[PDB]
Amino acid sequence: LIVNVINGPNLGRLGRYGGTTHDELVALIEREAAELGLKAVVRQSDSEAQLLDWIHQAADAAEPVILNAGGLTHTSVALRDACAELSAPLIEVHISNVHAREEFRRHSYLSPIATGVIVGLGIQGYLLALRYLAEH
Amino acid sequence: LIVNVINGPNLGRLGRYGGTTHDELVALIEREAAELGLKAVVRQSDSEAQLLDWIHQAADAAEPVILNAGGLTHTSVALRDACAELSAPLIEVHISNVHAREEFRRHSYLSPIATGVIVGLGIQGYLLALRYLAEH
Amino acid sequence: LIVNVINGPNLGRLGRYGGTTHDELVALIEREAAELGLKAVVRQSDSEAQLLDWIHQAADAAEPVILNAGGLTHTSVALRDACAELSAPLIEVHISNVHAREEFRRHSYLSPIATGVIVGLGIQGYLLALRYLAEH
Amino acid sequence: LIVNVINGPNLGRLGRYGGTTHDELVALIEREAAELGLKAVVRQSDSEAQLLDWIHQAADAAEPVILNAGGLTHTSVALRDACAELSAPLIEVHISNVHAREEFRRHSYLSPIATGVIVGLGIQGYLLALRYLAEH
Amino acid sequence: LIVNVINGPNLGRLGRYGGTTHDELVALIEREAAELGLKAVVRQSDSEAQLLDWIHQAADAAEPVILNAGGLTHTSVALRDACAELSAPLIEVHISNVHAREEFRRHSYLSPIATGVIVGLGIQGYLLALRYLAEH
Amino acid sequence: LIVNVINGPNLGRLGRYGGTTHDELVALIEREAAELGLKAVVRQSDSEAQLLDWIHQAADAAEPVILNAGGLTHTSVALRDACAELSAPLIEVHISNVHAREEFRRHSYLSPIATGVIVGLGIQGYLLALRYLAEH
Amino acid sequence: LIVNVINGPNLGRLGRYGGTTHDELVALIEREAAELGLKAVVRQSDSEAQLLDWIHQAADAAEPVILNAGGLTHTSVALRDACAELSAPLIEVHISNVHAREEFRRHSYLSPIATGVIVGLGIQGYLLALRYLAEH
Amino acid sequence: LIVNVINGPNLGRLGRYGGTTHDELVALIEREAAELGLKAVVRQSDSEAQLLDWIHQAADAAEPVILNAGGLTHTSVALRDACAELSAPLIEVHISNVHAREEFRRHSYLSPIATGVIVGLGIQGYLLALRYLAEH
Amino acid sequence: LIVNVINGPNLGRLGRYGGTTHDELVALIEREAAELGLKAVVRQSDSEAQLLDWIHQAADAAEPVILNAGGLTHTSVALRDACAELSAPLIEVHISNVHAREEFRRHSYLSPIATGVIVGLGIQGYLLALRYLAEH
Amino acid sequence: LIVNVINGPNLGRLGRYGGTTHDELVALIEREAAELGLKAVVRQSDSEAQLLDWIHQAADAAEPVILNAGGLTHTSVALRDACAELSAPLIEVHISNVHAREEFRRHSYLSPIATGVIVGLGIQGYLLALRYLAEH
Amino acid sequence: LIVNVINGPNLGRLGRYGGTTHDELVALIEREAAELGLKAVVRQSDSEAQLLDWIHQAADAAEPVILNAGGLTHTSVALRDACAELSAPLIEVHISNVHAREEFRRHSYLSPIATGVIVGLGIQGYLLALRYLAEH
Amino acid sequence: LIVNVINGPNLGRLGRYGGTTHDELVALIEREAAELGLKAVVRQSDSEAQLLDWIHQAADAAEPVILNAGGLTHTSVALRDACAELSAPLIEVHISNVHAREEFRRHSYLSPIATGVIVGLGIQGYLLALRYLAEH
């Protein structure tokens, strides 16, 4: 029933990844979750510690997480280790196709511990992740 | 309207990636495509040349492709170059989480030229790809 | 009782790896298998898909395989994944000593999933593999 | 007198490497070979096994080969080993400048066993290879 | 007629590579060599210098060697250089499949200078090596 | 009409790459250029600065260059940057097959900025380059 | 007119990079900016999120940034992506010569997206950056 | 007399590294420090900036630090540079054996600047570090 | 009760790692073990085979080992494989901080199979290891 | 008082790095040096030996050098070793941002021995270097 | 006056590095040392521990060492660390040109701690080392 | 009888590698060569082309060369290829121990084609090379 959507650094700047703003994204996700009979809790922080605290709470609550970690995807072992604690599914989401850009973006610390990964499908990636979780 | 789902080597062995057989997968995909108002053409070959011919035809027809290339994902430049010709969207799909296994599976020749990539969501990955294409 | 000997690309050219022709090799293997009280089914193809189909059938039949994949040894993830399905033993055979040539020949995708590997013992390698299987 | 021109995967799509179609290329090559007093046999396949069979026949016939292997250039040890059997000259041809694109295209399994290599001169590359062979 | 079987570090601990003890292995090898009409001299040391001395003596005597060097396989240039002096055949044997474990075990200093290599066939590997030498 | 043929270090030693001397090469190139209706200006220096000055002048004159840079092929960023200024075609030529020798010769700083590359066709490589330029 | 000088982790410890304190640095920068007819806004944080927020505000305001990111220079993709949004110039500044120390300090995620980089000129580096911006 | 024990990201989750909670760990450390005649100040944060501030204060106070940085061990140059300022001893502690897990955990930015490192001894690692400092 | 302290090559030279001699170290260790209610058996050899024999005996006796292997730490697969047999705890000890010196010293073949590792705490490292074992 | 500005290969082509010609650059530098109360001696050569001779003379005279070595930046150990002799400051200058182009341009042999480095600030880089030296 | 010449594994096999036997080498070295007014003590062992003991004794005696370590050159950190203790000069000698063979022979653990290195000058290398030491 | 001693870039600066000047070195070498009954021709240039010309002349004259190429040792394929033409012996000499400094100095393009190499023995290295050549 409850799903956590957690966005990391710079994702608050979506729109200004253009068109949709983060506020719009939250509204889309919430609308879509309601139709699926889920409740989406969508949060964004540029702070790794804040991110880690949200993940810790999903781990304690055994709630699933859809995570778009931004740059921390490629850099943060700490974030990986927090997510490795999740017992419910973890879907890694990237808006952009991370394999079509700089080589360094083709490595994720999260993918190996995620249930699955969706990249390059834009913001619909989040909606598709919600739908996976509604079937699982 | 028409979407090509193309599965590469070993994908004919799904079930015996267990539970669902390839015949079941075809039926699921077709059922789901019909609901979305699409027509899914689902094919599987262990032959790279056969794969290439299907991709060539999608390129000529400007039809979208959902491709799960199996091992060729990690090895075939030829397949990449055929897919690079597609003008409609190309969604790379892996059933398994390719980042949770051998290191060599973490590189795809296809990802950089794909619209996007879905891994580790099982066969629902294909359904989710269909839904992306129904919105695009 | 039944053992599959599968030879991959270029192995049909043995003799023209000189002296023994592939037809001779088949006759040697069959003669030796009969003495061991086995039946050897020996096949060769330059087609990866044909190879994969033979491996699929050995997997379904739970028959052991002696495989000399030729160049695909060093390149084919698809072949590896088909062989990874075998429940009976898989003996990788190379006629030449692959460690005494180009560096790229020193990596095999097959070895990690094989029961064992025999290289550099010429065609007797196949006979020795048959003898292993006759004890196991 | 007889020269084999062998084109690998995707080369059948030339034109749709734009302008000249493969049929046009065949006609150019044949016209040019006739002027040189050679007979050009020009073939294309997306199938590696078909390619290998053509190379095997050039090896048996001691005929020279001009080979544009497409993506297999960068991936196929099997193809290399077939070509390594050729006793007549082997000219590797690429239409595009393979050194001006992705890093992975800068490695060829064929170059070390080829007589020589022509890249980036477009389809005239094939004509220039024919002319080399007419002097050798 | 005479064949040297030389086992390196830790191979004296076989059994405690379980089931068969080194004493058992010696008895198996000797029994099998007698049937083949050979005399097997089987020795084991954890000392590299002792190993080197045995190899030096096989080189002086032009006797073949079956060598399972244990960890030194992956580390000892000195051992390689002693074995490179052997004029009779050198068969490298590993009980375990060295390609199915840690990456560092996939490199052998010995393979490039060995006649051939047998891995992963258990102690039967030694018997199979003896049989090769009985045909050569 | 005017084409610059520029040879770098050690190419003055051709003959003593044996048979043809550099003087012979110049005469062959000039003879062949005349037949093609071109004027070939052929120069050789062991001095990088001299080379750079010739390239600068071809850049100012918008004249094409056939360049065999010798060892500088593999080492000189300065030479690359001078050649990157050429607006007319740049054909990189190597007499020897640089892919059949030391690994370090398989990298060229020039190839990525050249129109194309001809290697391993001996001195005919230069003639073939002239012919390309006569068609372009 | 307005220029942002942003210092990252540990830069608050300057002096205790010795002699000048961060307070002194701020006073130098402000004095120098006034002479140039600019207004310098100088901030320091050990918090990446705080840094990111400052960069976001410079991006919204189209103000130039002089950034000395400290260790995050070498580690933070998130910081890079925030800076990649800046439309005004971005000058990366390091007090120390990062190429004269540990190898890991020779890579910057920022340099490729910066207008330019000044290292090893001490705190005068900041003054020199201000002067660049006063001319641009 | 005073020793700082600083724990980084995720270490607040110890117990839920299982059995002992962080509160228990603090009590153990304090009990043990008292017996040694030291005062242990034990702190934990998921925030790098908070960590850096604690390290800065130990540097100003010339107090020793026992640091278990969690994932930042493997990623944070900023943390390293703060710790490099410590004039009193710095003992790096890991509860788990970081060399028995993923390859990326086998590199620490901290070790080269630490006095020493204790890994894999569980929470007793902290007690053992305290005892080192009580002798130094 | 019984603990084996095993020192490898060059450790007999401690003092001439200065101050304490190996004889002193033995006396310290023995004194400390007695206080802990253990018996320490402390041995040193420059011979790998001797080392291996001691490890074999600890494995047979299920006694714990504190091992400072010296240079063999970084080189000996054989030693690793002997230690991998230990069923009681194995504590790797280095006197010096191996991460503050040459890069090659930052890899240990032993760490992945050790219970834990203590480096850079001088000879107190051994005492601290004894204390760990007295609690386990 | 006297400062040497030394430009390496291809820098004589500035303008035809566009807009400003090398003659203009010399005039700018001289004008700016005069204002600073310095005398700038500005030289350019495509010859490494000429460069080395200028550096040798600055070393003998203990004069500072601003060096833009062009491609030799990335290739010349000889140049580095000459510059390593300079006792006065050495400022490495690049007009372009060398970190925003080909990977090979991100390594400089000069940076580790330079006082500092300015890249990507265009020709103002030279003026800014002069100003550094006027303060030092 | 006294110089130690120490030869490592396989060097006892010189002659059977052909022509001169080790006994001959000893006689040459002794003859040459006498002429130089030195006393040469020449020893050879295939045992690393024996080697280490000889080096330890040269360190205690502050005697110079000429060392040809054979394969251990490329493998033994232990040997390096013993030699690093020598206060008198250490000349590394190789009979063969180690840079003209396998890539792995181009790395020596000894060179960085040696006074100097002579390779490829055959046994005269030892005589030349003696002469260096007679001048130093 | 005649031996060429060729010194490359920066070697003209010896003394200002301190103590002995290049003029002194020439006098030492000449004095020593005369005693050996040789004639030493000693030359130095900072110009690669000049170096190449000297090597070409030694190749034509079949005279031996002692070469200290300075930085070009590590960078110049052109120089290597000129030296590869020498039919008489080529001794590579370095004054400094190139293995005790920066990693990049541990690779020589010359060593693989040299007869032998002497490093780290100072200027006596040249004298020792002369003595080798006087015996060969």
Ligand SMILES: O=C(O)[C@]1(O)C=C([C@H](O)Cc2ccccc2)[C@@H](O)[C@H](O)C1
């Ligand atoms: O495609 C993604 O969703 C991705 O996770 C996001 C980012 C950054 O947040 C990029 C970014 C930059 C500016 C505004 C919003 C997002 C990148 O750091 C990642 O590489 C990929």
Ligand SMILES: O=C(O)[C@]1(O)C=C([C@H](O)Cc2ccccc2)[C@@H](O)[C@H](O)C1
């Ligand atoms: O997860 C996937 O969908 C993937 O594309 C599939 C394969 C292989 O087909 C694995 C396989 C093996 C046996 C039967 C069916 C599929 C693997 O080669 C790829 O690495 C990943």
Ligand SMILES: O=C(O)[C@]1(O)C=C([C@H](O)Cc2ccccc2)[C@@H](O)[C@H](O)C1
């Ligand atoms: O030694 C082998 O058996 C091996 O599997 C075979 C090949 C190729 O088939 C080589 C080859 C080439 C020509 C004719 C027959 C075989 C090589 O591709 C492999 O590296 C090694």
Ligand SMILES: O=C(O)[C@]1(O)C=C([C@H](O)Cc2ccccc2)[C@@H](O)[C@H](O)C1
């Ligand atoms: O330039 C070439 O001739 C080359 O051999 C060809 C290809 C592919 O065939 C590219 C391709 C793609 C689509 C249609 C035709 C050709 C690429 O795979 C190779 O990297 C280079």
Ligand SMILES: O=C(O)[C@]1(O)C=C([C@H](O)Cc2ccccc2)[C@@H](O)[C@H](O)C1
């Ligand atoms: O499989 C083998 O035969 C192999 O040569 C043996 C070893 C070691 O001896 C492993 C070992 C460990 C304990 C007892 C006996 C053998 C390993 O060092 C090698 O990697 C592989």
Ligand SMILES: O=C(O)[C@]1(O)C=C([C@H](O)Cc2ccccc2)[C@@H](O)[C@H](O)C1
């Ligand atoms: O094949 C070539 O044309 C090539 O450019 C030439 C050289 C050198 O000039 C080799 C050489 C050596 C001696 C005389 C003439 C040429 C090599 O440096 C390059 O690797 C290849």
Ligand SMILES: O=C(O)[C@]1(O)C=C([C@H](O)Cc2ccccc2)[C@@H](O)[C@H](O)C1
């Ligand atoms: O030279 C710089 O300005 C640099 O950005 C700064 C740092 C750190 O902040 C180093 C540091 C450490 C302690 C106090 C102040 C600064 C290093 O992390 C970077 O590698 C280089």
Ligand SMILES: O=C(O)[C@]1(O)C=C([C@H](O)Cc2ccccc2)[C@@H](O)[C@H](O)C1
């Ligand atoms: O073993 C350690 O103490 C280590 O420092 C800790 C971590 C993480 O904090 C792991 C972690 C994960 C969840 C809860 C607590 C700790 C890992 O990031 C490090 O690799 C090793």
Ligand SMILES: O=C(O)[C@]1(O)C=C([C@H](O)Cc2ccccc2)[C@@H](O)[C@H](O)C1
């Ligand atoms: O710090 C250690 O205890 C270490 O195990 C020891 C050594 C060597 O034994 C160094 C040495 C050298 C001379 C005398 C005693 C010890 C080094 O080989 C290892 O890298 C580290």
Ligand SMILES: O=C(O)[C@]1(O)C=C([C@H](O)Cc2ccccc2)[C@@H](O)[C@H](O)C1
């Ligand atoms: O940006 C620079 O100043 C740099 O030093 C210069 C060059 C070359 O000289 C590029 C060049 C090319 C053509 C004309 C002038 C300059 C490049 O070789 C370097 O990578 C960077």
Ligand SMILES: O=C(O)[C@]1(O)C=C([C@H](O)Cc2ccccc2)[C@@H](O)[C@H](O)C1
């Ligand atoms: O050239 C040398 O002197 C060298 O030290 C010696 C060896 C070995 O001892 C080679 C060897 C092999 C057989 C008999 C004698 C020597 C090789 O291990 C080294 O790579 C080089």
Ligand SMILES: O=C(O)[C@]1(O)C=C([C@H](O)Cc2ccccc2)[C@@H](O)[C@H](O)C1
């Ligand atoms: O030790 C040598 O003889 C060496 O060949 C010389 C140099 C340079 O010439 C170093 C140098 C620098 C200044 C004056 C003289 C020599 C270095 O470039 C090489 O790495 C080593």
Ligand SMILES: [Cl-]
């Ligand atoms: Cl990972």
Ligand SMILES: [Cl-]
């Ligand atoms: Cl790719």
Ligand SMILES: [Cl-]
């Ligand atoms: Cl693998």
Ligand SMILES: [Cl-]
């Ligand atoms: Cl290759």
